[PDB]
């Protein structure tokens, strides 16, 4: 039950975090153009970009375990 549970979220969080990676890249570049001559607002998104250090590397956390999960899943298909 633990690997069937993690199967659905593995391709889900793959696309969700990459949607959020491209959603936060757009949040970052639009405020960097708006608050360049204005105050250090980008900092208020940089603490959300500090949260992204989990997110960008969460992908790398999940890709590392994928190389472990997929060959196990394909081994379970045969039985």
């Amino acid at each position: 039950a633990e690997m069937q549970r993690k199967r659905e979220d593995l391709i889900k969080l793959n696309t969700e975090y990459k949607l959020k990676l491209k959603n936060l890249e757009k949040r970052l570049l639009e405020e960097l153009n708006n608050s360049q001559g204005n105050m250090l607002e980008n900092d208020e998104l940089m603490v959300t970009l500090n949260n992204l250090k989990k997110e960008a590397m969460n992908i790398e956390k999940k890709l590392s375990e994928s190389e472990e999960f997929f060959p196990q899943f394909d081994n379970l298909v045969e039985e």
């Binding site: 696309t15 890249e25 570049l29 960097l32 970009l49 250090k53 994928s66 997929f70």
Partner: protein, 143 residues
């Protein structure tokens, strides 16, 4: 593609040798339509990371040096592009030849396709899913 079409009729169809190349044509026409659409989208994302590379170089507080690290992705692209030609091959065959096949009949042919892709000098994505590859999450929800 020739070795796939020759294998498709050989494995899937019964009834006596009546029928001939039609899928082959539509398969080829799909690939061209899809590679052009994929090359335009890979160059678009590479233009999106080139614009972010010039934005960080203008700035150069503790974390910004890692976004060069976020920048590494830069090396990733070339590997991602080398598989997009063979990835489009599978996508076009699914669009063309698979429509009328069974769950088992689809997977089975996919094997014969993938091992044909394995012997020829084309690179394909090991973790490949036809849904994820051509559907957008907005469409997928909408359906």
């Amino acid at each position: 593609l020739i070795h796939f079409d020759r294998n498709f009729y050989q494995k899937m169809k019964v009834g006596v040798n009546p029928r001939s190349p039609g899928y082959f044509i539509d398969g080829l026409r799909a690939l061209v339509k899809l590679v052009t659409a994929k090359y335009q989208d890979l160059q678009e994302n590479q233009r999106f990371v080139n614009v972010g590379l010039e934005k960080l170089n203008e700035s150069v507080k503790s974390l910004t040096f890692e976004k060069e690290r976020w920048l590494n992705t830069t090396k990733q692209f070339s590997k991602t592009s080398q598989e997009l030609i063979g990835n489009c091959i599978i996508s076009s065959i699914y669009e063309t030849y698979f429509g009328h096949l069974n769950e088992r009949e689809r997977a089975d042919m996919l094997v014969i396709l993938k091992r044909l892709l394995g012997k020829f000098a084309v690179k394909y994505d090991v973790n490949y899913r036809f849904i994820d590859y051509l559907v957008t999450l907005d469409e997928k929800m909408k359906w």
